[PDB]
Structures are given as structure tokens and as C-alpha cells.
Amino acid sequence: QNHTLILGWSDKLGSLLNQLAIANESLGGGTIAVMAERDKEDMELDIGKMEFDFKGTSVICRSGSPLILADLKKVSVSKARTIIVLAEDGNADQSDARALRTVLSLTGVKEGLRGHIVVEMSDLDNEVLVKLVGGDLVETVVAHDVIGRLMIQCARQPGLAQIWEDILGFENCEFYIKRWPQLDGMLFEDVLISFPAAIPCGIKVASYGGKIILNPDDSYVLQEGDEVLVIAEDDDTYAPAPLPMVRRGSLPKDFVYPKSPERILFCGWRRDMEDMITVLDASLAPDSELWMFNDVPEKEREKKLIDGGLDISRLENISLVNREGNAVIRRHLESLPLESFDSILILADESVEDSAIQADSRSLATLLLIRDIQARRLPKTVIISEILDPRTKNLLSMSKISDYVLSNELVSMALAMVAEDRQINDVLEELFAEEGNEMHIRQADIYLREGEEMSFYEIMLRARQRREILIGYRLANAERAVINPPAKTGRRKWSLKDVFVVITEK
Amino acid sequence: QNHTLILGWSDKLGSLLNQLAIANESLGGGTIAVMAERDKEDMELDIGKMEFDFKGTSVICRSGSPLILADLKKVSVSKARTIIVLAEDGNADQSDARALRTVLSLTGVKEGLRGHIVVEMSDLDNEVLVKLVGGDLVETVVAHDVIGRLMIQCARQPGLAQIWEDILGFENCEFYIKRWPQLDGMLFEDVLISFPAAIPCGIKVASYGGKIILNPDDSYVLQEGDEVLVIAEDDDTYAPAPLPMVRRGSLPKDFVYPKSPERILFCGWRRDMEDMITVLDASLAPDSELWMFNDVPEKEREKKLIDGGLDISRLENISLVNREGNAVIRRHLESLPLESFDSILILADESVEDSAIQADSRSLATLLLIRDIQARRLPKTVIISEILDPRTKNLLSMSKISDYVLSNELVSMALAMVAEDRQINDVLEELFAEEGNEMHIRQADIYLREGEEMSFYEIMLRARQRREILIGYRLANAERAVINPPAKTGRRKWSLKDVFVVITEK
Amino acid sequence: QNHTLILGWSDKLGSLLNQLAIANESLGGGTIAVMAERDKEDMELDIGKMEFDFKGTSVICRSGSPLILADLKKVSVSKARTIIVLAEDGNADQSDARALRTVLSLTGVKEGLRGHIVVEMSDLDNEVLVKLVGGDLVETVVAHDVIGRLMIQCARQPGLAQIWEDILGFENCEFYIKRWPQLDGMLFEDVLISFPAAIPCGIKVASYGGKIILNPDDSYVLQEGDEVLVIAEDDDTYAPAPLPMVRRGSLPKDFVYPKSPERILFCGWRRDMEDMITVLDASLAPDSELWMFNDVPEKEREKKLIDGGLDISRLENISLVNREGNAVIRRHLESLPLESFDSILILADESVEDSAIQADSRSLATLLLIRDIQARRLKTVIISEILDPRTKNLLSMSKISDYVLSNELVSMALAMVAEDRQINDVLEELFAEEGNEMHIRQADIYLREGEEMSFYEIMLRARQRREILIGYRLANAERAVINPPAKTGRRKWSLKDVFVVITEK
Amino acid sequence: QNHTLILGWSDKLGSLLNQLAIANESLGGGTIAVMAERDKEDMELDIGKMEFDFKGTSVICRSGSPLILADLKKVSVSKARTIIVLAEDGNADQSDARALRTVLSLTGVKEGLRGHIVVEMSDLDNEVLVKLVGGDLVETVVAHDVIGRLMIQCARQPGLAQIWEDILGFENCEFYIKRWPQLDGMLFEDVLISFPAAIPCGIKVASYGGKIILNPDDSYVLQEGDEVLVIAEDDDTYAPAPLPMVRRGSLPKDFVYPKSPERILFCGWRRDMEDMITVLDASLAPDSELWMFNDVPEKEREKKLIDGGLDISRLENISLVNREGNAVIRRHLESLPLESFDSILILADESVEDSAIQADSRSLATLLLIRDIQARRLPKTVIISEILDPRTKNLLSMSKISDYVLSNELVSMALAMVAEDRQINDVLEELFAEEGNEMHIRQADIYLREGEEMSFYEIMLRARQRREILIGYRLANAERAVINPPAKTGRRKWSLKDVFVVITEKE
């Protein structure tokens, strides 16, 4: 029926539904079939009570185990254009085992499948497994590690959460891949300035066989059958135009990059800490500090690390220190240089991670503790927290300076994007993983000196000197940010200091 | 409309409902909406099985979570004159977390609120967070800890429980605040005897922006706009009168009597009992002893108690004695020297703190076993027991057993009062806290000599020589104390065995 | 509208219902209401799952708690002829505390109570509390620890369980108390033989305010208003008759008193098992051994017993041996010297005392395993505590492997006290070790071999020992006979016969 | 009515139903009644969601307990041809107790029983109990231990699982017991070659009341009333034939017996694992080591082993190595030397043995992780996995086959067999227990020299010199082994790489 099928049930589904509906809003009616081992009464009730509208969308809730070929016959599995396996609310091993079993069951359909499979997993190690047993039809979104992986992106550099919400979220922007016959033999330095209403930053290469290369080298001009990856409000924006001239300038280069403090605190025993400590060794070089709030004996945690294969003898860019305490009792958090942490991270821990109601509660509690204790300790740092619940992610109501909670809706949004164009998975898997490209903002001192009047494209070419494709600007105002504006590529007026959003390599 | 809204469902709801109805009885009726994550039909059934009369007040049951904005719209939260966030019965931290998120969701209303929020919190540590989140329009009531504090007071000064019940309860003589334009420029010590049908306690000074000072110095001169805080029968029952001619005189009898080391027993282990321990240390004379008969093993007792943040090292004039056993097994209780304890406090154990009637059954068994052992082993001890139930509502028992005991009804009453007039909570706080003023029962010889004939106003004027406000008396052979007596100008001959209940500084 | 009301729900509900139904058939029917915190439809299903006959009695199920007045009013508590508060499953002290709360709530009824309250209680000490709140209205049936005592009693009197089943149950026979103005002025020793169809046990003395003296003196002269307590078949089957001619034989010979150090095994941990230990210590000769095979760790057991308030030094006859293991593992049972035990008691464990069938499964496994091990490796008395009499019925055609007894007896007891509350006193005195108790005695105590005499003459011989002869079990009879029909007629008696007597301590 | 009745409901039920359906195809159809304490509508839904064809057999779903006589009479237990009491969802000791109470209730039926009772047991000790109350009418199938022993056997001779599957399953090969008046007075060693379309295994001796010896001595001379036990396709497919002239060869070579000390890995903790340990200790050569990777703490392991009656000191050929970790966590699995193990046994953990799919899911993850670590760490180890929803678990879409896995379906098959012909249980009881004789896969060089041209009957007669009954072969390049070959008198160029399937004495 060319419909979207979802298997299982979790806190994420809600936001996922919204995302998908938004998509189908641009292409007419939408049909999503959700099936799980639950009452058809129970599912439809929760569906009807959601806080957002399903523009031109219907949700068909059915009771059945994804492991039974007949229950999959009921949901037109062999006809769905996408099959989204959701992670089980609870223990991650149970969720991953059931996910592998559901993918096996999906392979077991004798006729075949019209679409692909989008699996939400909870560990990096098990990912490989699914790709072995589902092969072609399978795309895996490692949810847990991905959220912990962009937690450091939003924490190191404050204000990056809403950027991912607007890019991944189908409302404002999303990734599009379009074949433009005009620009085949065009220099990539000329291609990125060939689009006004969008910003091209990726390239599919026929000679690599549809492989998408992010941040290609400027001087590579492409084949006739090639597709460019741009970002815009909708799939149809104004591109390409005649090449506008830019003031080709020079970087006031600040070779030293001298102050890179990045004393960073973790206030959680996250289920995979080796993952976060390893992704974070791409931050800096000068004795990058890293503090771990354990709640667990330290001799135990060194074994926890060697379990993940992580070596203290190997980590090149940070040498970390360990402190033990508790995150709901106040005097333990008291004895910390909270005022000397460029970032504080309030995680949900191994213990009580399955409990959606209590880990998030501990997170909110620690946030309130830190703000109040510091407000009485003085005679401004950055804080970010992890909230598992979608209801509590919706509890964004406080618009103050510390309101950085990362919805796991991002994962949902990811599951939505891959559900629509699986190619984009291969781009998220690169923009998330630290190797290869990554989204940084304000990477180098003085792209901009002394209040210049340079246009956005002049800066794109100025910063391409450091393998950087430029994406967005902010203003001196807070709680606002705009990404790839359609109005004016070339301009004379704009803010003074370092409101700069980029893809780079580090 | 202006209706009372209650979010959640606990054992204290019925009592609360009762008080609310009493309050609305003066208005000819009222409206209460109750919303919880329960079935509507079952909620209405439970309302039907409650034995009191609603007195023209209607209770409406709606099934919803206070975290969804739509359910809040279903119960007209924006129109409600007051919101009462009850605490769930299961876990102190679980109810505290639910309350924190409920206050957050009530802030999440886009249209705003019309009334104020009264939040029942089950722990002092988590309370501060909700105070911070609520800010301008939130009042917090500390439940478990207030019960703990009041029990020791009633144990040392017997009969205070019924006094608190009558004063807090709307059944008679609740706190009223009214502006009297006639009374202005009069010193407060004359303003107190200016009301024949009411007893003035404190003053809300308009010059101080409206903070209610309790037990002010007599020199205070009334200002324009200032209002009176008084104890009276009903809203239209009290009115000022010309000052009655009254003997000022001087009856200080100043020959003081030293204190005496006392012996106290704690039955069962109570959650947050460390606060009770500290309060009892501050309350007793040097060289006093506290016995603790708890099922918690002696090894875990010191950890679990110091885990509560109690430095035994800061102990001043208490000695600790530990005993292990079940509070309902008679053979365990006979092992203790019950006759040697100056006071006994039967506490609802932390192990069964959740269940109301399941815990109060164990407490009642303990009481009956203690009294039967004191009767049979003998060839008079004051005993106060923690009750939560409608069990006390029966009150089959007679006075010889001190079956008068502290109840959860106090909590309900407090909630209702703060739902009617906000500031009252602050009042109660200083009254319940050791700081500021507090209620006391004092012997008659403190204020008068034996067989001395005088009137109530003269007694009040004599108490004022101690910065104390006379609120009432209990005669020698009277069961119940009398609060706000009617015959204030008329003489009675007072007995050395009589007692007086006064608001006094510390 | 007078009818029986039951508050709570336990496994004993079905059996109790059966007994009540038996009682009400003579009146053409009756009514029983059951109220607990359960679904009405599901309770009605549970009623449907009961295999016995209601005999014109209707059972009403209502969903409500016995603590709210509205639920009690839905079940017409003020009009009810009797209230039966079961001890709902869970923690024994918690169930007894809830029984105290239920009694307190029943006192709160504004309109008052027509009938009396029957309280199922587990702990013996708390009983007075329930009386304190209940006063006149309350009858407490504390049978768990006395049942434990009775198991030990059966280990020396192998058939006593069925005797208790027949007496407590309304089917075979029952205690009846009635006023016969005819017998006024008669010595009791004549009242005993004055009933052909019944055996008089006690007297309700009006001069004593209504107290029932059990096993009264023969010299007692009946006064006006006194009533007779008898064991009889039914209410209208017994009536006094002229005295039968009976030979006063007066020929009991005093024999050699048999005493022997015994070896006993206790399988599984029983609630308040320290009480059973204390009862057994008084029962055995010195240098005797009590073995205890429990899953409870050997280390934790001494604490668990001293919490029960049992000192080991002062009890002296028995010596204790402790062993740890599971009663359902055949290997663990092989670890015990099963062949050496004079008696073995499979006890329903405290962990599964609530659940009927889960407890009886372990008990059945343990019994069959012990029997098979005694068969594979080589007289042993074996008693088994069962909680579903349907288990003893599923066992059928007399397999003869066990002497068995159930907690279902408690239901019977409750039923008795629900009909005639006076009878409770009787029960008390018989179940406690103090005062009177029922016993099975050998024939040689009362007669010589092949002596030809009638039941009445043996009964008088027993009166020479301050005991009321109530029945006999012949040598080759499985079922013992209570209140025999042929009392006046001669018979030849064998030493292998046994007699059932109510005797003082 | 003579319908089949099943008391209880477990995960292995559907498979069992399938087997019954196959059998009832031979009779033109059948009827199966299922009674359990579950919803009727849900039970019929589960039946409707079963993917196989019932072949004219009708399934009836009723909600009731086998402990109430009224439900048993609602399902016509007295008229039933066979009763099958399944065990499910409880500690092995609790579910066996449910079965014991069920058998007692079935004895309690006053009107009597038309058929016999087949009782699935989870513990070996309890069997006699089920006998004692049941006596003649009960046949006991000791389920869990059967799979446990069979896994260890398959690890040392790979592919034995499919052999057991085919022989127990009614599809390709069944045991038949039939009387042939023609073969009277004939030596058993001649009765062996008398059937062209069938392989004679045992004899039903009338002199012993019908007890059947499965490997009679060659000298045994058949008596009147005796019946023959054979492996055949169907009841009407095999018949006796005149004796073929066959070369009475001699055994090729007697060898030095060399025993190589082996290395075994146990993933997950299995109920009664001490039994697997002791069997393997009896099976292996000295100086061998057994690794055990389960989440149960090593401290608790000593208790869990000693209550099962395992003394570590009494082991005489095996030394124990203990390792702790989660079987679905890759990093824990990397800690073990996976490449060095002569055999690996992925066991469904006791913690999830009740739950059907959770155990095989964890097992599948563990298997794929072990294989992937073996792949990614490199400059031919035997691997067996316990699976419980097998037909679906053996993926059939990507031409993908699991590594010699073992199934819970075997239990269903066994039950079905004993439900159809009760006598067969004796066979199973002797074949599945290590006592008496048992099935084995044996290398070819024991029986012949390389490139020797001879027929199946001649190899079988060679095997008879070692008290072994040759029942089949697996060729060198064969995915499946051949049981009851069709051309038995005919020659073939046998390679040493071939293997033979034989019923042999223990020693």
C-alpha cells in the first residue's frame, strides 16, 4: 500500500509520528501502520491523545508480535515502503536481541519487501550483527551512542541542540539530494556559491557508485550524472544561479589557537562511558581535562573501562581525573569547580536507565541543585542534561539560560529521515561520528576581524582554506538562530564576533 | 468560575475534601474538581463511599494526568481559584518527583493561571527544588516532617494534638484576617482586648508590604490599611467592641524550676527520623536518654541514619539506645522497660510508610500491647502513636489510653487552609518550626497563685509579660481544652492543676 | 434478612461454604454473602469452580472492603446473623492486624450488629486485642498452633485426624447443646447412659452463668435451666430414654507404663514452629532426638527461633539436630536417615502457607519421595499437612502411605462457631494442651481379651478414669466410629481395638 | 471418539500439534483437544496463527483446569485415545509438581481412562513419582536432560542433531514395530539383511512380555510371537525379502586408540548443568579443560554445583575454568579465547528457559558475536546452539544455515511418538540415556580401507562384528545424512571422508 510500517512501541513513537506526518503533509495523504504486542484499545487511545496534529495522516494500530509471519501478513509488510523497528523500552540487551530477531523475521518473508528496514539499536557492538543478517534492506540507527555523541557537540559548543532539531526536524530544514545537469563540470568551490536559497555541502559520485562524499575537495569537478546534497526549507528551492563575485580575502590565521581550556564535567554513569570518552578525544590537545562523577568505586570503573577496550595508555587528547560522589545529595556536588567547567553534563545512568520516570527525575533534580547551589555560593557556565521521556522533553517550558535538554526526539527524527531517504543515513552516520566530518561552530579565532562587512559566501570561501563548508549564522541575540537564509547571500551588515556554524574535520 | 482543583489521589483526599466542604459551607456550597490517572467511574464510586456530607459542595472526577495540557484544560486549570498538588502514597521521592513535574507542567500552561498552587511535599530536601520552580505563585506544605515534629511536642505536652486539630480544622475557630478601619492608631496590647468574640494573634503590617508578624511587641501602633489576624468562630461572628475595663495588675511569680532529664522511646523506624532525633535533642534536658525499638538491624541503623546526613558527633544531651524486634509482637515489647520511659512515641515504620491502614494497624497493635503489658505486669505513661487512617475517626477508646494522637488529617487541614488564604502557610511554618513563635501548654502556677479569682482578659495581660499570647485553657477535670473562650471579662477561680495554652516565643 | 456474612477471601472459603451449606439444608436453604477486595465476576467464577453442593443455599459476591461502611451496608452487616472475618493471605502479623482493624470497623456500625463476629487469627497473643475492641461481639478462632500440636498428637495416635474431621464437620456428627427438663435432678453418670442415640460430653450450668463445663463430675446434679452438650448425628435424632441395665465391671488392670526415646523428623519450616518444639519436648522421654530438615540456613535458624522466644537450655527431654536442604530433592532426602525415625511430619512451609496448591504440591512430593526412599533402603509414622482436602480425595482407594491432616479443619471450626458461639468454648478446651483433650487409647487399658460387654459398660469403665468414652475403632476398621448406634448390646472385644476418649491432662 | 487430548499449554505445543497432524494424515484425519487455563478465543487465535497445514486434523480449544473433574469431562478425557500433560512457565520443580497433581487428578477419574498418559517431565528424579500414582497408564518423557545430553554428543560428532530430527520426526524416518510370521526361526544377523526398504534395529520378545531389546546378539533365533523393530519410511513401505548373497568381510584394520585432550566452552548456565559436566567428564580424555561463560557469579557456582551432587575433586579427566560476563555484550565475549575451543556449546540460560523466544534470541546474538569475533581476529571450531522456535530460527530466505543447532522441537516429536505407540518409549528411554546402547557417528576407517568398493549390507555385517547396527551414512560432500538407504545390495566407491551412523553398545 506504499505505507510506512512501525514495529514495537516506545516513548519515541509519538514524536516519530509527528515527523512522518510532516513529511507526508507535502505529498498528500499518509498511512502509518503501528503494530506491537499490545491492546488495539491501548494503542489507539495513546495515539488519539498526542499533542500535535497529523496533517493528512492516519495511524493503524494493530496487535501482534513482529516475530509471527501472520501478524506481518496483517500489516502488508511485503508492501510497506519502510519498516521501522523501534527499540524496546527497558533493558538494552532485551531490545537488541528482539531487534535482531525482528530483522531475522523480516528476512523470513518469502515473497520479499518493497522497502528497507530502519532499526533502532542501543549499542555500537551489536550493529554489525544486524547488518550481517539483513544485509541490503537494513539501516541501523545506534540511538544511545548517537545521543551521547551529539551531547558532546551541544555541550562543548552551546546552542547546537536547536540546530540539530531544525536540520533533522522536517519543519524548518532537512537534507535533499538533487541532480542538476548544469553543474557537472563545475568546480566545487564554484558549486557551493552557485546556490542562493540553499547551501550544497554533499556530493553523490557515480564513479564511486552513488557514494555520498561530504566536504569534497574543491578542485574536483564531477560527472554528468551526479547529485548534490543541499539544505533548504523544502525540496524545491532556487538553485542554481549565476556565480556571484565574492571578495576573496585572507584569514587572520591565529596559528597558536592558544586558550582551549575545555575543563568538562560528567554528572552521570552513562550506560556506555567508553563511547563518550572516546568520541571526546577529538576536542583539543593541551591537557584537555575531563571529570567523571562516578557514584561507583574507582577500582571498579577502571575495570568498566578495560571492558570497553579503552586504554588510559592510548587516549591522546585528554588525560582525565576521577571523583566519587552522589548526584541527589547536595554536599557531594558542592565540592567541584562547577564555575570552572566550560560544560556540565547531567546524564541518566546505568542504574535506573530503563525506568523512564526516575532517571529523568534525577536529571532535573541535579540541574536545580546546581543552579541553586551556585546562586548561593557567589558573594556563568554551560549546563546540559539528558531527558529520556518525550513528555519531559516537551517540558521545555523554562526558557532560561540553562535550558539545554536533549530530546531523544532527535533519535525519532533520525528514524524519520532514514525512513524517507536511506542515503541520508550514510550522511548522519558521518556527521555524528567524530571521524570524517563533523559540525562545529566557532572553530577558529577570527574568521572575522575588526567588524568586516564580508558576505556569507566570502566567508565560506575564506574558511574553506581549513576544509570547512559554512552552514549557519547566529546573532548577538540568544534563543534564536537561522540556518542557510534564502534572502541575501551577499550583504554588507551583520554581527561582529564569531556566530559561525560549519562542517569541518578534526 | 472559581473552583478548587485537586491534582492526584492519596489517602488524605477525603479529609481534604471534608475540610474544603466545611469552608464552602459558609458560602452555601462550592465546587471541587479532582483529576488523577485513574478511572472516572471508580473515582466517583470512591467519592460515594465517603461517610461525610459535602454541604452543598460538588466533587467532579476527571481521568487525566496533570502533565498533559489538554487534561488541564478539561478541568479548567486556568479558571481554577486554587490548585492542590497532593503527593502520591508510594515513595517520598516518587511523590516528590511527581510534584516537581506537576509544578513544571502547571507552569507550562500558555494562558496562565488564575489562582495559586499548594504543593504537598514529602521531604524537606526535595522541597526546596519545588519552591524554586514555583517561585511567585506556589505554596509548599511539608508533610512527613511536620508530623514528626508535632508528635514529640504532643508527647511532652499532653493534649496538644486535639488543640491543633481544632485550630487548624474548619470545624470551628479557624484563622481570620480582616481590615477594621475603626481600629487604627491603637497600641496592639489594647487591640487584643478590643475583640470580645475573638483573640488577636498577629498583625499583617501594610508598612512591611503585608508580611504577617506573629506575636508582635505591645508597643506596635496600628497603621492605616493594617489588618488583624485573629481566632474567631465564623466570618461574621466577630467584631470589635470598646475596650473592657480590666485589671492590669502584676501577677508574676518568678521563682523558677529547673528542668529534668527525661527518657523517651521511639517505636519503629521512621523515614527522615534523623530530623526527629535532632529535634528531640534540642527539646530535652541534659543527661536524657532516647530508646529506639526498630526492626532495622543495628549494623544498618548507624549507616542508614548517618546516610540521612546526621552527624552523631553533633549530639548534645541525648543518649542513644538500640533494640531490635517487631513492634506488633508482644514478646518483643515486653523486653523493654516500658514503665521507665517518660514518654513513648509509636511511629509508623518506614518499612510500611506507604500503606496507610496497613501501617496504622501495626501501630494500633503496638499501642494495645504496650498498654496491656503495663496493666498486667504491674503488681499513666504518656503514649502518642502515629495514625493515618479513618481508624481514629471511630475513637472507640477512652481517655485512659491517650488514644488522642497525631493524624494525617492535620496535613489535609493545612492544605485546605493554604488553599483558602496563602500567607497562612508561612504562619504555620514559624508556628511549627522552632524558629519564631510556637504553641505551648503551661502550668497554672506559672501565671497565678492557687485559688486566685480573675478573668480571661487579665490572664492574657499577665501572659503578655512573657511576650506570650493566651489562646486558651484546659481545666483540671475537663476532657477538651477551650480555645477562644466566650466569657473573657468574667471571673473564675483558677486551680493549680489547670493548664493554659499560649503562643510563646522560643 | 438474617444471613451469614464473610469478610475476606482465602483458600478456606470453599470448605467453610460447604459446612455452612450442610448446616442450612435442614431449614430448606440459607444465604451467604462474600465481600472482599476482588472482582465480583471473578469471585462468582471462583464459586462456580467449587465441586460441592449448596443444598438450597445462595451465595452472594460483592466487591468491597470490610473497612468502609458503605460496602458493609451493601452486604447488610447490621441484619446479618453472623460475621466471619477470614485471615486473608499474606504476612501472618499483617493478616492479624487487618483482622483487628476489621473488628474495629465492625464496631463502628451505627445501627449495630444483630449477630456475633467470628475472627480467624494466626498469632495467639493478639487475640485479647481483638476481644478488647470486640468485647461481647467477638469470637476468635486461633487454630494454627493447636493444629501443629495435633500433628504431634497424631504421630502417637495415628487415626486422630479423621476423628477431628468427623466431629468438626457437620456431616458425620456434631456437638449439640439442648435443654432437657426431663433430666433435671439426675446425677450426670446417669445422664451419660440416658441417651441411646447420643453421647453426653458436657453441661451448660445456669448457676455458673452459662459456662459449659466439659467432662463434668458424675456427682453433678442437674439444675433447672442446665443444658446437655452431646455428640450426636443430627438435631432431632437424640432424646433421653430410661436407663439401660449395665454391668459396672470395674476391672481395669494397671499395666506397665511404656516409655521410649523416640526420633522425630520435621520437614519444612512452619510458622511458630518453636511452639511445636515446646509442645513436643513435654511429650517425649529423655535422650530423644528431634531432626529438622529445613531450607532455612542452619545459621539463621537459631535467631529465627529465639525471636519466637524459645530457650534451648530449659527444654530438656529432646535434643535438636539441624539439617539443610530442599524437601523436594530426592538426593537431599537420601542424605537423612529416614528409616530411623519413629515419626516424620511433613509440614506446610511458611513460604507457601498462603497458597494452597503450591504448598500441597511440595508436601505431596516430599511424602512420595520419603516413602520411595524408605522402600529402596531399609514401621514409620508419617503425617502430612495439606491445605486442599481435594488432595486427600484425589488420593483415593486407601493408598495407606500417609496419615494426613488439613488446615481446612479451621474452616469447619469457623462454621461451628458461626452457628452456635457457645461451642467455641468447647473447642478451646479441647484444642489447648491445658484442660481436656481427645485421645486414642489401647484396648488393654479398659478390658481383658475376649471380654463380652456393651459400649455403655466400657463407657462407665472409662468414667472410672475421668474420661468420656465417645467411640471406638475396631482392629480391622479404617474409619473410627463416633457415637456408635449399638451401645446397649454385648460384643466380644480384642486387645487390638482402640477406644476414643475425652480425657483430662 | 478416540481423540487426542493435551493438558496444558507451552511453547512446544504447536510443533507437537504438527507432528500429530502428520500422523493423522495416514489415518485420513484426526481430532485434537486442547484444554488449558487460558482464554478460548486467544487459544484459537494462536492456533490460527500457526503456519503449517493440519492435514484434516481439527483443533478444539477449551478453557479449564485438568484438576477439576468437570473440565476433564467437558473435554471427554475418558474417551480420549491419549493424554499429553505438558509442563510450562515455572521452575522445573514447580512445573513437575503441576504435572504430578495433574496425573493424580487423571487417576481420580472414576469412569476410567481409555488411553494412556504421556507426561513431560523437567527433572529426572520425579519420573518414579509420576509412575507411582499412575502405574501402568503413565509414560514419562524426561525432556530437559535429553536436549542437554544430546548437545554434548553433537559437539563431538557434528550433524547428529539433524539425524535425531529425521528419525524422531514422522516426515522422513520412523521406528516401526511389526510381526512377520515369515521370519520365524531366523538368526537375527539374517533378519538384519532381510529388509531392503528398512533397517531392522530391535526385536519385540514375547518371552519377556513385550520388552524390546534394541541390539540383540547375532546368535538370537526369533521365536513365535516376536516382533521386529525397524527404521522405515512408513508402516506399509517395508516388507521382508529373500536373503541377498553378501560378502562376509573382515574388519579392515585394528588401530592404536589415540585420545586427544579437547577444549570445550559452555555459554550460559543451564539447569542441572552438573549433569552435563559429569557426562562430559566421562566422555573426554585426561588433561582436558572445560570453560564455562555464564553470568552466575563464581562464588554461587560452587553452591549451585554441590547441591546437584557434583564433587569437583571426583572428576578424573576434566579441569574446570570459570568466566563471568554477559553473553549478548560483545566486549565480555572478546575476553574469551574463542578461536582455540575444540567445541562450543551455546546453551539457553536457565533464567530464560521458560521464556521461549528470549533464550534463542540471546543464543543467536551470542553465536553471531562469536563468529564475528572469530572473523575479525585472524592472521573450523564446532559450534552448537540451543534454539527453541526452530523452523523460523533456521532462516530459509538468504540461503543461510545455522551452525549445527539443536531444537526444543525434539521434545514435541518424542511426545508425539509416545502418544501414538507407547511401547516405543522404551526404545527412546534406552537410546537417550547413556545406559545400554546409543546412536553414534563413526569415522569410516574403522569399518573399511580407503577406496574399497563394497555395498551397504557388507559394511553393516562388518559392523555386526563390533555389536554395532549400521543404520545410515553421510557422504563426504553431503549436507544431510542418508538413513535407511534405498540401494543396500549395491556397491559404491567409499571414501575415508564418509561417515557412518550406527547404534552401538556403550563399551
CSV table of C-alpha atoms in Angstrom, one decimal, chain B residues 293 325-333 358-367 369, chain C residues 91-94 96-97 123 125-126 129:
chain,number,residue,atom,x,y,z
B,293,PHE,CA,12.9,-0.1,69.2
B,325,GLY,CA,12.3,-6.6,67.1
B,326,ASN,CA,8.8,-6.4,65.7
B,327,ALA,CA,6.6,-3.7,67.1
B,328,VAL,CA,3.5,-5.9,66.9
B,329,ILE,CA,5.0,-9.0,68.6
B,330,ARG,CA,4.1,-8.8,72.3
B,331,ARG,CA,7.1,-10.9,73.4
B,332,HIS,CA,9.4,-8.3,71.8
B,333,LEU,CA,7.7,-5.3,73.5
B,358,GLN,CA,-1.6,-1.4,56.9
B,359,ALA,CA,0.8,0.7,58.9
B,360,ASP,CA,-1.7,2.2,61.3
B,361,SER,CA,-2.9,-1.4,62.1
B,362,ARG,CA,0.6,-2.3,63.3
B,363,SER,CA,0.7,1.0,65.3
B,364,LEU,CA,-2.6,0.2,67.0
B,365,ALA,CA,-1.5,-3.3,67.8
B,366,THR,CA,1.7,-1.8,69.4
B,367,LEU,CA,-0.4,0.6,71.5
B,369,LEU,CA,0.1,-4.4,73.5
C,91,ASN,CA,2.0,-11.8,56.3
C,92,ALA,CA,0.7,-13.5,59.4
C,93,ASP,CA,1.1,-10.5,61.7
C,94,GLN,CA,-0.3,-8.3,58.9
C,96,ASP,CA,-4.0,-10.5,62.2
C,97,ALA,CA,-3.6,-6.7,62.3
C,123,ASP,CA,-1.0,-15.2,66.4
C,125,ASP,CA,-1.1,-13.2,71.8
C,126,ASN,CA,-3.0,-10.7,69.7
C,129,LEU,CA,-6.7,-7.2,71.4
